[PDB]
């Protein structure tokens, strides 16, 4: 019984190689493309040998042993990866655990900057090399990217270049195709990173809870046993992928996609479109499937979960199953709620039973349990209404700026690039979610907010700067967004010392693209808040407007630098007075 042969036979050579390339790229993010390709081929050649004869020497070793041994043969390991050479002394599974610790969530690699003429040539010159290069580039930038899903995006990446290279207009799919794919890559990466973060920081229990809530919303027709079945299998898939077991992850994901499609009539009417597709496409469509219509025979929950006299007995006899059933029943009923809200509601239900069942007369106590949920629902609904009201009034750029001020005040010790990133991400959430139908706003906003907050938390694990951020990031997954919302200006913070050069602009800003100009100004905005943390958002908006006007004027000037030189220092000095 050869594991590597077993995976090679199940997956096929193409997907086997793709996943192995991705896995290696994620583990060793600094190595060049050619180096990894060689290791992939070496591993694949061995798999073929084992497929021919599974009794052969070393074919019965574990995948982690074989792939771990392979990574440790890389040239200049100690120089390039000083930390990783230490892992190579260790044995499995200790070695892989060491490997996973050293994955870098922020490698700070160059921007993709597609060159359509050169890339279409390389694509035509060698497609396998070209598509493989793409897997490699994204994988090392996103060390926790969902392995099988990255192969799906490589196919979209192929279809773009296939359709557009022979066309007349050279860059007819630059902004249209690659920028859209780039956006989908970011969202997908953020979604999977949350799952891996949940395993790491809160355990498998938290991942299953989240998954029960989400899949109940998606598949309200399905029975609890069906959802539990799917959650169990899907949790194992993500567990394997998050721990670098990409071949096993891909294989189990295929098995799950098959199961769902075989039982689609009892699961969801929306799956039929997904289930008449190829493998990678089918799995992707299932994963992103639209929520099914609510069945007309949804049961009233007051009887079982509020009015039944033996709830304390049920709760005590099997807490997991009873609470699991509640979460399933309440979630399928509420596609208009965010997942974290449903998890908060489930925690409040649990807490109510813990309290009420210790008292003398539990029934009278827990009779009003559903009424405790109302304030939990109103708070996020109010936040989303306020944020969307602001977004629709001022637009994305100014909405981003308001969020940068908001979060810099909460966490002024965090780096400016990180504060700008989260502010800009949460601004795009406005564009994405506030235009949706009204019932879909809350789930879209809060679910995306969870992704952006996790990004901040993951960067904070690497570079801790604030005890308040640690607390919100590690105390409770469900309470994370309310914790961050509750943060106010850190009074313990001492204003960052003034540096004139930080707010000094030059003629180089004028040649930049619009998004890059914004980031420079938004970076200055974060720095303004850091030096003057008590300045109001209204003061800051005005001062930034003056900076924007100053940049606009001097970029339209005959002598651009002389304009920046004369005008800048006065404005820099005057701005500080405006922020008192």
Annotated binding-site residues for Ca(2+) read 3, 10, 240, 245, 248, 251, 255
CB of 156 to ligand TES, least distance (A): 9
Instruction: Name the burial class of residue 475, with classes exposed (0-12), middle (13-18) and buried (19+) by CB atoms within 10 angstroms of its CB.
Output: exposed
Q: Return the number of the residue (334 or 560) whose C-beta is nearest ligand TES.
A: 334
CB of 202 to ligand TES, least distance (A): 9
Q: Which of residues 328-347 bind ligand TES (CB under 6 A)?
A: 346-347
CA angle 564, 570, 576 (to 5 degrees): 120
Q: Return the number of the residue (235 or 522) whose C-beta is nearest ligand TES.
A: 235
Buried b / exposed e over 126-145, threshold 16 CB at 10 Å, is eeeebbbbbbbebbbbbbbb
Among 31, 63, 74, 209, binds ligand TES (CB under 6 A): 209
Q: Return the number of the residue (322 or 564) whose C-beta is nearest ligand TES.
A: 322
Count other C-beta atoms under 10 Å from residue 125's C-beta.
9
Among 38, 205, 316, 471, binds ligand TES (CB under 6 A): 205
Q: Return the number of the residue (138 or 154) whose C-beta is nearest ligand TES.
A: 154
- Is residue 444 a contact point for ligand TES (CB under 6 A)? no
CB of 242 to ligand TES, least distance (A): 17
**Omega before 93 cis (within 30°)?**
yes
CB of 55 to ligand TES, least distance (A): 27
Among 70, 90, 103, 158, binds ligand TES (CB under 6 A): 158
Q: Please identify which residue in the block is written with the tokens 């106590």.
A: 365
Asked whether 51 and 8 are in contact (CB, 8 A), the reply is yes
Binding-site residue set for Zn(2+):
64, 243, 245
- Is residue 154 a contact point for ligand TES (CB under 6 A)? yes
Q: Got the DSSP string for 236-299?
A: HHHHHHHTT-HHHHHHHHHHHHHHHHHTHHHH-TTHHHHHTS-HHHHHHHHHTPPPPPPPTTPP
CB of 319 to ligand TES, least distance (A): 8
R_g over Cα of the chain: 27
Among 23, 51, 84, 135, binds ligand TES (CB under 6 A): 135
- Is residue 369 a contact point for ligand TES (CB under 6 A)? no
The Cα–Cα gap between 131 and 119 comes to: 11
Of 541, 575, 502, the residue nearest 401 (C-alpha): 541
CB of 13 to ligand TES, least distance (A): 7
- Is residue 151 a contact point for ligand TES (CB under 6 A)? yes
- Is residue 35 a contact point for ligand TES (CB under 6 A)? no
Q: Return the number of the residue (14 or 272) whose C-beta is nearest ligand TES.
A: 14
CB of 380 to ligand TES, least distance (A): 18
CB of 569 to ligand TES, least distance (A): 54
CA 215 to chain centre: 18
Q: Return the number of the residue (338 or 400) whose C-beta is nearest ligand TES.
A: 338
Among 350, 461, 490, 567, binds ligand TES (CB under 6 A): 350
Segment (H or E) for 275: helix 271-275
Among 324, 380, 412, 423, binds ligand TES (CB under 6 A): 324
Backbone angles phi, psi at 132, to 5 degrees: -65, -40
The long-range contacts involving 189-193, CB below 8 angstroms and separated by at least 24 positions, are: 189/142, 189/144, 189/145, 190/451, 190/452, 190/454, 190/455, 191/146, 191/451, 192/144, 192/145, 192/146, 192/149, 192/238, 192/241, 192/242, 193/105, 193/142, 193/144, 193/451, 193/454, 193/455, 193/458
Binding-site residue set:
3, 10, 64, 240, 243, 245, 248, 251, 255
Interface residues toward ligand TES, by CB under 6 A: 14-15, 17-18, 128, 131-132, 135, 151, 154-155, 158, 205, 208-209, 212, 320, 323-324, 327, 346-347, 350
């Amino acid at each position: 019984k050869s594991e590597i042969a077993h995976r090679f036979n199940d997956l096929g050579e193409k997907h086997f190689k793709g996943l192995v390339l991705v896995a290696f790229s994620q583990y060793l993010q600094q190595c060049p493309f050619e180096d990894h390709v060689k290791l992939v081929n070496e591993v694949t050649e061995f798999a073929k040998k084992c497929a021919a004869d599974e009794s052969a020497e070393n074919c019965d070793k574990s995948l982690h042993t074989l792939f771990g041994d392979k990574l440790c043969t890389v040239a200049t390991l100690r120089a390039t990866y000083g930390e990783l050479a230490d892992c190579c002394e260790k044995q499995e599974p200790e070695r892989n655990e060491c490997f996973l610790t050293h994955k870098d969530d922020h490698p700070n690699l160059p921007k993709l900057k597609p060159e359509p003429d050169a890339q279409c040539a390389a694509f035509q010159e060698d497609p396998d090399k070209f598509l493989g290069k793409y897997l490699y580039e994204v994988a090392r930038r996103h060390p926790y990217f969902y392995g099988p899903e990255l192969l799906f995006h490589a196919e979209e990446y192929k279809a773009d270049f296939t359709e557009c290279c022979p066309a007349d207009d050279k860059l007819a799919c630059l902004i249209p195709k690659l920028d859209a794919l780039k956006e989908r890559i970011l969202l997908s990466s953020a979604k999977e990173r949350l799952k891996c973060s949940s395993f790491q920081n809160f355990g498998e229990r938290a991942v299953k809870a989240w998954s029960v809530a989400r899949l109940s919303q998606k598949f309200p027709k399905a029975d609890f046993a069906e959802v539990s079945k799917i959650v169990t299998d899907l949790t194992k898939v993500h567990k394997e992928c998050c721990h670098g077991d990409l071949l096993e992850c891909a294989d189990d994901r295929a098995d799950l996609a098959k199961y769902i499609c075989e039982h689609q009539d009892s699961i969801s009417g929306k799956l039929k479109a997904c289930c008449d597709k190829p493998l990678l496409q089918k799995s992707h469509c299932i994963a992103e499937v639209k929520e099914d219509d609510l069945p007309s025979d949804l049961p009233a929950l007051a009887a079982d979960f509020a009015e039944d006299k033996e709830i304390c007995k049920h709760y005590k006899d099997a807490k997991d199953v009873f609470l699991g059933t509640f979460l399933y029943e309440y979630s399928r009923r509420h596609p208009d709620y965010s997942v974290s809200l449903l998890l908060r509601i489930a925690k409040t239900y649990e807490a109510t039973l813990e309290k009420c069942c210790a008292e003398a007369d539990p029934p009278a106590c827990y009779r009003t349990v559903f009424d405790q949920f109302t304030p939990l629902v109103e708070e996020p609904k109010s936040l989303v209404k306020k944020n969307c009201d602001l977004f629709e009034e001022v637009g994305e750029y100014d909405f981003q700026n308001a969020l940068i001020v908001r979060y810099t005040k909460k966490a002024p010790q965090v780096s400016t690039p990180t504060l700008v990133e989260i502010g800009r991400t949460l601004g795009k959430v406005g564009s994405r979610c506030c235009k949706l139908p009204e019932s879909e706003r809350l789930p879209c906003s809060e679910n995306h907010l969870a992704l952006a907050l996790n990004r901040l938390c993951v960067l904070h694990e690497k570079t801790p700067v604030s005890e308040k951020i640690t607390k919100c990031c590690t105390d409770s997954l469900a309470e994370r967004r309310p914790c961050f919302s509750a943060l106010e200006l850190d009074e313990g913070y001492v204003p960052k010392e003034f540096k004139a050069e930080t707010f000094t602009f030059h003629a180089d800003i004028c040649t930049l693209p619009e998004d890059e100009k914004q980031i420079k100004k938004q970076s200055a905005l974060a720095e303004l808040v850091k030096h003057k943390p008590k300045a109001t958002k209204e003061q800051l908006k005005t001062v930034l407007g003056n900076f924007s006007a100053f940049v606009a004027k001097c970029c339209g000037a005959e002598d651009k630098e002389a304009c920046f030189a004369e005008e800048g220092p006065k404005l820099v000095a005057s701005s500080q007075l405006a922020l008192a």
